[PDB]
């Protein structure tokens, strides 16, 4: 987090949380509650955050790089599925049909 | 054909830099051993190796520095001297303390033929 | 004060013996010695170290995986100590002082005596 | 002389200090490589100028410089335990024809595992999906952990047998993440072949939960099952898996996948026992008095090692004696009466499947 003017409280990637006023130029915008903040090589001075980011592990796809298994094959969990039918489809491509229901999409 | 007694000089003045530098033992450590070379992409030659160390820290290192591939495959106690990290000898062996030896003794004092 | 007066005057002296054998740091216990001159020692705090001796040390009067000090920068001998655990569970269960001498007896005789025979005869 | 000098030379090569190892995590731009040590902190830094990025990818493993910790050299894999579980070797081969039974035993481990390798066609002709693993258990008989070290150095190919003791690593027990690192290399080195002793004790139910040292052996469940239950194919490994007994397990390994057939020992049939004997009598040599359904009809309902062992005890308590060949007559008597002695211990050997 950014405690107050000019300076903020930051851990480095060896985990430890510190006080250092910020760099003068960028203050605010970019900097947000929550991101990764490059540390001076000697100080741990906060600079600047990443784009943000190329992040560090996983990072998703595993199905254009492989593999992927056909689900229609088996037809018995049909009522199984009953709930990721209703439970994955809309509420990802929709999110404004939640705002007309009147009822919240569950995270469940 | 003199210069064979000034290389041999030579050779112990640099044995006695082998002497200060091992480059001593100290630091216990152990291996990780490969093969490699460079050629780009000029050409050169080469080769690299792999260390652990009592922080747990682990190293890429070209060939050690001082004896060589010739043992072994990773095995303990390779010496080693903080920024130097080069082996120079690999001592024998194993570990620990009670742990190593549960129970080393002479014999028992007395024996079977009494009872 | 008094005894606070004098208690602050010697730190001169203390600061002084400070500088030598303040860096004895850590207690630590060997591992194996191949031959005369080499030792290597193992640590609680991940350090080990295949290292040599302070010259006030001699060789045989010194134990395999024994707790010594040393000057963790040449990472010398300094002087094994003897003590390994354990914490003050020890220092509860190990007891001391007197109290409660045979008088309290409440007349027995020798069931008392047939086992002080055993421990106190 | 020279030679001496020339490792001197050596030496004067040495005192530059090895780089540190590190593993490219992902990239930014060309001056800046999300990069982190192997103690946690994260670092971006330049390369060298030889190389390409398509040297180097995203998530590999290369080495920085001490000081500007730049990009310069690297090896894409590397690993401590791999091949120091490869080197137990098994006498046999001809240990196949040593095991004495059993035939569907024996033959059919050898449709289980070898020709999945040889002709997987033959598994696309019918359609059938090929068998990635096998189980033994017991012990009723016994065998599971000759026949495993047997088929080893008689099936050929490429085999590592996984240590089933030191997993635990004390210190941090995440090694499920070596079963991984393991597998890495498993579909590097593709094909290999794996047995595991001792499934059970890792096995472990958390059936009504306790203490600590539990959760840490659950946790190196998760990753087996997961890495079972993949988002990856592991068809070129051969997962192979005995143990004391097949019950506690849990039902997430008991299914097909993880457990993909089910194969065992029992008592070995003194008909079977006939055979078994001859290659425990083959290496011995006495003199040529000989009835082996004798000390089959005698000694009865017992295991290959125990016959062998007491067998081979018998003509060591027959030799006791001091002479050299010995007649069935001492083993008809100690074969006998020593295993009387072994079968007052066979008490409680009769287990769940």
């Keep these: 987090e950014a405690v107050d003017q000019n300076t903020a409280i930051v851990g480095s990637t060896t985990g430890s949380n510190y006080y250092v006023r910020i760099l003068s130029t960028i203050d605010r915008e970019l900097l947000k509650p929550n991101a990764s903040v490059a540390l001076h090589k000697h100080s741990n001075a906060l600079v600047d955050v990443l784009p943000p980011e190329a992040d560090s592990s996983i990072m998703m796809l595993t199905s254009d790089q492989k593999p992927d298994v056909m689900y229609a094959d088996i037809g018995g969990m049909d009522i199984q599925k009953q709930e990721v039918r209703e439970a994955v489809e809309l509420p990802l491509t929709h999110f404004e049909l939640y705002k007309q229901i009147g009822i919240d999409p569950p995270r469940g | 054909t003199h210069e064979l007694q000034a290389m041999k000089d030579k050779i112990k003045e640099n044995s006695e830099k082998i002497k200060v530098n091992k480059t001593l033992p100290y630091l216990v450590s152990n291996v990780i051993e490969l093969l490699d070379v460079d050629p780009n992409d000029s050409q050169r030659k080469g080769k690299c190796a792999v260390i652990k160390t009592s922080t747990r820290q682990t190293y890429f290192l070209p060939v050690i520095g001082l004896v060589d591939a010739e043992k072994l495959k990773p095995g303990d106690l390779v010496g080693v001297n903080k920024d130097s990290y080069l082996i120079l000898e690999t001592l024998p062996t194993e570990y620990d303390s009670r742990v190593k030896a549960m129970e080393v003794d002479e014999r028992p004092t007395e024996q079977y033929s009494d009872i | ?121 | 002389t020279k030679q001496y000098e020339k490792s001197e030379n050596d030496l004067k090569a040495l005192q530059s200090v090895g780089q540190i190892v590190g593993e490219v995590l992902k990239q930014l731009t060309e001056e800046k490589f999300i990069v982190k040590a192997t103690n946690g902190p994260r670092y971006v830094v330049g390369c060298r100028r030889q190389l390409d990025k398509s040297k180097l990818k995203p998530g590999t493993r290369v080495a920085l410089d001490m000081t500007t910790l730049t990009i310069m050299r690297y090896l894409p894999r590397e690993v401590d335990p791999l091949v120091y579980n490869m080197s137990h070797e098994d006498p046999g081969n001809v240990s196949y024809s040593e095991i004495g039974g059993l035939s569907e035993q024996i033959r059919e481990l050898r449709e289980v595992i070898e020709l999945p390798l040889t002709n997987p066609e033959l598994f696309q002709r019918v359609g059938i999906i090929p068998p990635k693993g096998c189980l033994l258990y017991g012990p009723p008989g016994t065998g599971k952990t000759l026949l495993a070290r047997a088929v080893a150095s008689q099936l050929d190919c490429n085999f590592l047998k996984v240590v089933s003791s030191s997993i635990v690593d004390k210190y941090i027990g995440e090694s499920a993440r070596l079963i991984r690192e393991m597998f890495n290399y498993a579909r590097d080195h593709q094909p290999c072949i794996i047995f595991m002793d001792e499934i059970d004790a890792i096995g472990g139910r958390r059936f009504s939960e306790g203490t600590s040292a539990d959760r840490e052996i659950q946790r190196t469940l998760m990753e087996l099952l997961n890495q079972m239950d993949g988002f990856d194919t592991l068809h070129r490994v051969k997962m192979i898996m005995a143990t004391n007994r097949p019950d506690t397990l849990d039902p997430a390994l008991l299914r097909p996948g993880r457990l993909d057939r089910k194969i065992h020992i029992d008592l070995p049939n003194e008909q079977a026992r006939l055979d078994i004997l001859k290659i425990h009598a083959g290496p011995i040599t006495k003199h040529g008095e000989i009835d082996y359904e004798a000390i089959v009809k005698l000694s009865d309902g017992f295991n290959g090692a125990d016959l062998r062992n007491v067998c081979t005890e018998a003509g060591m308590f027959a030799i006791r004696a001091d002479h050299d060949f010995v007649v069935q007559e001492d083993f008809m008597k100690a074969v006998r009466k020593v295993a009387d002695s072994k079968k007052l211990e066979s008490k409680l050997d009769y287990k769940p499947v």
């Design chain 3, 1 to 121: 004060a008094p005894p606070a007066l004098w208690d602050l005057a010697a730190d001169k002296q203390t600061l002084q013996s400070e500088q030598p054998l303040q860096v004895a740091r850590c207690t630590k216990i060997i591992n194996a010695d191949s031959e005369d001159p080499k030792y290597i020692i193992n640590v609680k705090q991940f350090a080990k170290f295949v290292v040599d001796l302070s010259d006030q040390v001699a060789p045989t009067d010194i134990e395999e995986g024994m707790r010594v000090g040393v000057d963790r920068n040449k990472y010398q001998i300094h002087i094994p100590l003897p003590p390994k655990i354990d914490p003050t569970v020890t220092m509860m269960q190990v007891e001391e002082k007197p109290d409660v001498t045979y008088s309290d007896v409440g007349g027995c005789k020798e069931q008392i005596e047939k086992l002080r025979e055993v421990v106190e005869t």
